[PDB]
Amino acid sequence: TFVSVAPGQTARITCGEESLGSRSVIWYQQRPGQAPSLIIYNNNDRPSGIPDRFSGSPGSTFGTTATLTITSVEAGDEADYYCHIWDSRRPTNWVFGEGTTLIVLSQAAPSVTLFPPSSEELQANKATLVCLISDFYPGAVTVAWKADSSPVKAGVETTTPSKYAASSYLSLTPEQWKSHKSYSCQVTHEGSTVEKTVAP
Amino acid sequence: QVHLQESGPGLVKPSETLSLTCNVSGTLVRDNYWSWIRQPLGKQPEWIGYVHDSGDTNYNPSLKSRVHLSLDKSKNLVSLRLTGVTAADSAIYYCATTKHGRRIYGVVAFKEWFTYFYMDVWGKGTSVTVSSASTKGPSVFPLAPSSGGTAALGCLVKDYFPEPVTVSWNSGALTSGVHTFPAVLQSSGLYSLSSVVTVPSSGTQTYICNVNHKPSNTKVDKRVEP
């Protein structure tokens, strides 16, 4: 799931089934592009390097769910969080609990960059226009391409953005590239559309 | 420092056996429990198993008949083999040191005593794609600087399979200003990605992107010039 919070405020993240027996919950944090790292073990013990902003709910009151609380949240805390539940009355869990994405609303509008094909690609008889989109929130954009004024019906590949940054690539032949006056990348974000153009 | 580094083939065909290695430094393998963990794209981690030199070893039941874990004391490494793979086995695979703890109460609560494990040091992970599609090495092209006193500058890594590709700038001596985008999986079934750096426009330093595609044993250094 998702949890959003403002910087300085408190985040709470719920993970796993309601408790049955005595509990030991382990929490992991996963930053974008990184391995999970241990944040809490044995319900509320922290390993080296983890500050007391991070706390876990006791393995305690029967029929309740484990919660990780992060107080005084900073942008560095933005990550996916997973628990691994040990419950004295249940079989060993071999899958971690379903993750929760923590969003820190530091706060939005995209930076767009548009590159023409390289001389080197052109020398290989290929051409790709590269439209780079970054530093935007929330993570919804649509990208459209224009050849002169005409909509492009083919050769466009665009990433689903992630933690946001996104990419769009227009594949063309070298003569298609040289033919038109220009090509444009149009990025539509939160009611507005930002355009950049490129030409031979 | 305890330091784990996984390695593997990047690409495995369906029905083949996946073989991974975890190279360990900063501790001896006999002195730790070891886990393998995998995480499919967009999903949570799944614990594969834990192994110890004592024989105190156990495997995820869902993988029981297909998985083997080993320790090599002579080479200080941990190994995994997973047979009969399919697309469901595609994931990033991680090696981790695994510590053990016990919840201990009064003897009146003996039935509720239990042991738990936590993974305190993880490797960087190795990417495993199970696919019938063949490996393809990338084509790397420079994204030349042209235009706040600052310009952007990058490298296009085009049409490779499978993931992943690593891109660095100046062999690692440029990590600031750097944005390496996540790859796009194209309709061709190949991936492409780009990496960009932001630099002051004034003819000092040289900018080289270093691209490595381990699954195809491809390494490319690309100079990027105006």
Q: Which residues fall within 8 angstroms of residue B74, CB to CB, at 6 or more apart?
A: none
How distant is the Cα of A35 from the closest Cα of chain B, in angstroms? 6
DSSP-derived pairing of the beta strands A183-189 and B77-82: unpaired
Measured in whole angstroms, the distance separating CA B74 from the mean position of its chain's CA atoms is: 24
Any chain B CB within 8 A of the CB of A111? no
CA angle A174, A176, A181 (to 5 degrees): 115
Q: Are both B116 and B167 inside the same structural domain?
A: no
Which chain A residue is nearest to residue B119, measuring alpha carbons? A38
**Contact in structure between A57 and A69 (CB atoms under 8 Å):** yes
- Give the residue from B80, B113, B132 where a domain finishes: B132
Last residue of a domain, one of B132, B148, B180: B132
Which chain B residues have a beta carbon less than 8 Å from that of A82? 44-45
Do A167 and A129 meet the contact criterion of CB atoms below 8 Å apart? no
Class of domain A105-200: mainly beta
Domain of residue B151 covers 133-226
Co-location of B75 and B20 in the same domain: yes
- Both B151 and B72 in one domain: the answer is no
Whether A53 and A104 have beta carbons less than 8 Å apart is answered as no
Same domain, yes or no: B110 and B180 = no
Give residues after which chain A gaps, C-N over 2.5 angstroms. 107, 163
B63 and B145 both lie in a single domain: no
Element (H, E) at A185: strand A183-189
Residues after which chain B is broken (C–N above 2.5 A) are: 147, 202
Indicate if B175 and B114 belong to the same structural domain. Answer: no
What CATH code is carried by the domain that includes residue B31? 2.60.40.10
Chain A interface includes B81 (CB < 8 A): no
Same domain (yes/no): B151, B120: no
Domain ranges of chain A: 1-104, 105-200
Interface of A with B in 71-110 (CB under 8 A): 82, 84, 86, 88-89, 93-99
Inspect the interface and report whether the beta carbons of B45 and A35 lie closer than 8 Å. Answer: no
User: Quick one: B25 and B125 in the same domain?
Assistant: yes
Q: Is A38 on the interface with B (CB under 8 A)?
A: yes
Residues B3, B102, single domain; the answer is yes
Do B38 and B118 lie in one domain? The reply is yes
Q: How many domains does chain B have?
A: 2
How many angstroms is the resolution? 1.8
B77-82 sheet: strands from edge to edge: B3-7, B18-25, B77-82, B67-72
Q: Do domains A1-104 and A105-200 have the same CATH topology?
A: yes
Inter-chain CB proximity B196 and A95 less than 8 Å: no
Beta-sheet pairing, A2-5 with A100-104: parallel
**Cβ-based neighbours of B217, under 8 Å, separated by 6 or more:** none
Nearest-angstrom CA–CA distance, A38 and A4: 22
Q: What angle do CA A110, B146, A197 make, to 5 degrees?
A: 50
Based on the fold, state whether residues B5 and B116 are members of the same structural domain.
yes
Residues B78 and B123: their CA atoms lie apart, in Å, by 12
Check whether residue B201 and residue B103 sit in a common domain: no
Is the backbone peptide bond immediately before A51 cis, with ω within 30 degrees of 0?
no
What are residue B71's DSSP bridge partners?
B78
Please tell me the distance from the alpha carbon of residue B22 to that of residue B38, in angstroms, as a whole number.
Answer: 13
Last residue of a domain, one of B99, B115, B132: B132
C-alpha distances (whole Å) from B216 to each of A104, B81, B123, B134, B141 are 38, 21, 22, 10, 18
Q: Does A139 touch chain B (CB under 8 A)?
A: no
Question: CATH top-level class for A1-104?
Answer: mainly beta
